[PDB]
């Protein structure tokens, strides 16, 4: 037995489920407005469920086209891919500068998916893997965010494009691209003094050091000698050159520098960031990464299951719903329970650093490029049973009220288990929807859904069931 609470009210409490349940529609149905009847139109097909996959099965293999077809625009190919390597790379000379063993590592999607549209922000994660074994990562990252900041300022990054997010709970550098080849891998030094024979021979000589013998193509001056033009082998050699520091011999004698053009740069200029001083989202972005590359069609659904949590409300994490992480748990969690994908302990992934290769994350093509019509085609099926039968999993069979989305064993996860099956109970850690963090210890992905917000998430499961099912939530 135990306490029940309203989370649209602040007085009603009750001593069983059923009667906050009830409470929930006879109050406050106008915070729930299309639950009762989507359900009751749900329930309908749940006694013929197999008679309405077989008549509508062209429809659902239709949906798996589409699912494809989705994907598919996420993947621009691996060239694209590589423009984020090379932006990684920009950026790990820039902060070595702060921070020499420092080292910059891409998570995010372009990790957990494989493939990058050129246009998704890029998460950079900066760390010093020593340290981070000494257990002394991050240093105090509101200096951090400060120090980083000053040099991409330094190196032409403007203060329109960057955001320093110093005091936030995880401090943060953001930076914003703005919409708008020799130039883009050409940089200007400007002095502010003329240099004499001896000091452009100096700052040369500084800007072949940072690069290395192939590394720059062409050096040239002003005729007032207080401007020096360099043409690098690489956009991320000319990033390396403009790091230099150069020490010219003329007492007072002072350079800056940046891109010769204002908007064709280097990769890391055009492209959103965030960059973070921490290791965490590294391995939460290569746990996804290895269920969601174990089966064709995961990353597609994936994908299109982000895409429907953000439009249908369910995945906006600001209001208290789930975040794109949370999304991506509940659909691996049904494959494995399904048995579309092997089950995969999280504790497989080292929180060390220390052997980590993939700085740059490896390109995967969402579908195989030689596979045949035919094989394709059963790709489609298989994409849309997978995706329709997600819906009905969470709709109709997984139990919401006495378990927990886990990925931390094999098997069923109770509330009771984690200690989730009583709430402390305003704005209470809510226990209604419950997805286990993998590597946060008794943190509740669905914590601030209380019960009309649960009812909410549990209307647009049932849209999305029924949606499948016809020729929308799922409109691009
Ligand atoms: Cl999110
Ligand atoms: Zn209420």
């Given at each position: 037995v135990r306490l029940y609470s309203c989370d649209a009210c602040p007085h009603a409490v009750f001593t069983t489920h059923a009667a906050l349940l009830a409470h929930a529609e006879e109050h406050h149905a106008d915070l729930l407005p299309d639950h009762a009847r989507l359900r009751r139109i749900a329930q309908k097909l749940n006694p013929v469920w197999n008679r309405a996959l077989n008549a509508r099965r062209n429809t659902i293999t239709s949906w798996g086209k589409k699912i494809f077809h989705v994907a598919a625009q996420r993947d621009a190919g691996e060239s694209k891919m590589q423009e984020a390597h090379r932006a990684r790379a920009q950026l790990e000379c820039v902060v070595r500068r702060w921070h020499d063993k420092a080292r910059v590592f891409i998570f995010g999607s372009s990790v957990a998916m494989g493939v990058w549209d050129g246009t998704a922000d890029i998460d950079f994660a900066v760390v010093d893997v020593d340290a981070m074994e000494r257990g002394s990562?991050?240093?105090l990252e509101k200096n951090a965010v400060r120090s980083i900041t000053e040099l991409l300022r330094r190196v032409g990054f403007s203060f329109v494009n960057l955001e320093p997010i110093?005091?936030?709970?995880v401090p943060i550098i953001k930076h914003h691209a703005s919409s708008p080849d020799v130039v883009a891998r050409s940089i200007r030094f400007i002095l502010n003094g003329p240099a004499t024979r001896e000091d452009r021979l100096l700052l040369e000589g500084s800007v072949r050091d940072a690069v290395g013998?192939?590394?720059?193509?062409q050096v040239w001056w002003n005729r007032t000698s207080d401007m020096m033009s360099a043409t690098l082998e690489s956009t991320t050699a000319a990033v390396r050159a403009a790091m230099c520091s150069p020490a010219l011999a003329s007492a007072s004698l002072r350079t800056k520098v940046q891109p010769a053009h204002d908007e064709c740069r280097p990769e890391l200029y055009n492209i959103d960031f965030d960059l973070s001083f921490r290791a965490f989202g590294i391995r939460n972005s290569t746990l996804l990464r290895k269920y969601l590359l174990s089966h064709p069609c995961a990353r597609p659904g994936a994908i299109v299951l982000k895409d429907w949590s953000k439009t249908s409300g369910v995945n906006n994490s600001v209001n208290g719903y789930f975040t794109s992480y949370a999304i991506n748990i509940m659909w691996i969690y049904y494959l494995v329970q399904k048995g579309y994908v092997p089950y995969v302990d999280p504790?497989?992934?080292?929180?060390?650093?220390?052997?980590?290769?993939?700085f740059d994350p490896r390109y995967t093509p969402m579908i195989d490029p030689e596979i045949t019509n035919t094989e394709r085609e059963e790709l489609y099926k298989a994409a849309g049973d997978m995706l329709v039968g997600f819906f009905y999993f969470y709709s109709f069979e997984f139990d919401w009220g006495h378990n927990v989305i886990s990925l931390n064993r094999p098997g069923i996860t109770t509330k009771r288990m984690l200690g989730w099956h009583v709430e402390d109970v305003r704005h209470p850690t809510r226990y209604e929807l419950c997805i286990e963090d993998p590597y946060e210890?008794?943190?509740?992905?669905?914590?601030?859904?209380g019960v009309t917000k649960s009812l909410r998430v549990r209307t647009e499961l049932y849209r999305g069931l029924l949606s499948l099912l016809k020729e929308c939530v799922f409109a691009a």
């Open positions: 990562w991050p240093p110093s005091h936030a709970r013998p192939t590394g720059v193509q504790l497989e992934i080292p929180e060390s650093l220390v052997n980590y290769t993939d210890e008794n943190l509740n992905l669905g914590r601030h859904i």
